[PDB]
DNA sequence: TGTCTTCAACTGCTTTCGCATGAAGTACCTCCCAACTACTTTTCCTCACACTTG
């Protein structure tokens, strides 16, 4: 019983992590470090003035 | 006259990447086709009757 229900959890976890990856990977892909060390999106809109606040 | 509230119907998604190996619909219709048997077809073959004879 335990071994099967383990194989079920093993076979379902990967479907709940693809949408977790892509759903915000679409959003932050534009998000990068400006040359001034500020985090701007590929739009240019500033997200953080420093990475984690320490660069 | 003006603004507000709930419910139900409607929208869009909910692992990735590849092998296999592609197959199969089907009603309505049929004209074509294959069949069994009989019937029909083209060339050829061979004999036969009457009037007259003597």
UniProtKB/Swiss-Prot annotation:
It comes from the Eukaryota. It is found in: Nucleus, Nucleolus. Disulfide bonds: none annotated. DNA-dependent RNA polymerases catalyze the transcription of DNA into RNA using the four ribonucleoside triphosphates as substrates. Component of RNA polymerase I (Pol I) which synthesizes ribosomal RNA precursors. Besides, RNA polymerase I has intrinsic RNA cleavage activity. RPA190 and RPA135 both contribute to the polymerase catalytic activity and together form the Pol I active center. In addition, subunit RPA12 contributes a catalytic zinc ribbon that is required for RNA cleavage by Pol I. Present with 2840 molecules/cell in log phase SD medium. Belongs to the RNA polymerase beta' chain family. Component of the RNA polymerase I (Pol I) complex consisting of 14 subunits: RPA135, RPA190, RPC40, RPA14, RPB5, RPO26, RPA43, RPB8, RPA12, RPB10, RPC19, RPC10, RPA49 and RPA34. The complex is composed of a horseshoe-shaped core containing ten subunits (RPA135, RPA190, RPB5, RPO26, RPB8, RPB10, RPC10, RPA12, RPC19 and RPC40) where RPA135 and RPA190 form the DNA-binding cleft. Outside of the core, RPA14 and RPA43 form the stalk that mediates interactions with transcription initiation factors and newly synthesized RNA. This is DNA-directed RNA polymerase I subunit RPA190. It comes from Saccharomyces cerevisiae (strain ATCC 204508 / S288c) (Baker's yeast). The gene is RPA190. The chain holds residues 1000 to 1054 of 1664 of the full protein.
């Amino acid at each position: 019983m335990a071994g099967r229900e383990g194989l079920i959890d093993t076979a379902v976890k990967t479907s709940r992590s693809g949408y977790l990856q892509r759903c915000l990977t679409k959003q932050l892909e534009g998000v990068h470090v400006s040359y001034d060390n500020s985090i701007r999106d590929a739009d240019g809109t500033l997200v953080q003035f420093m990475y984690g606040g320490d660069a």
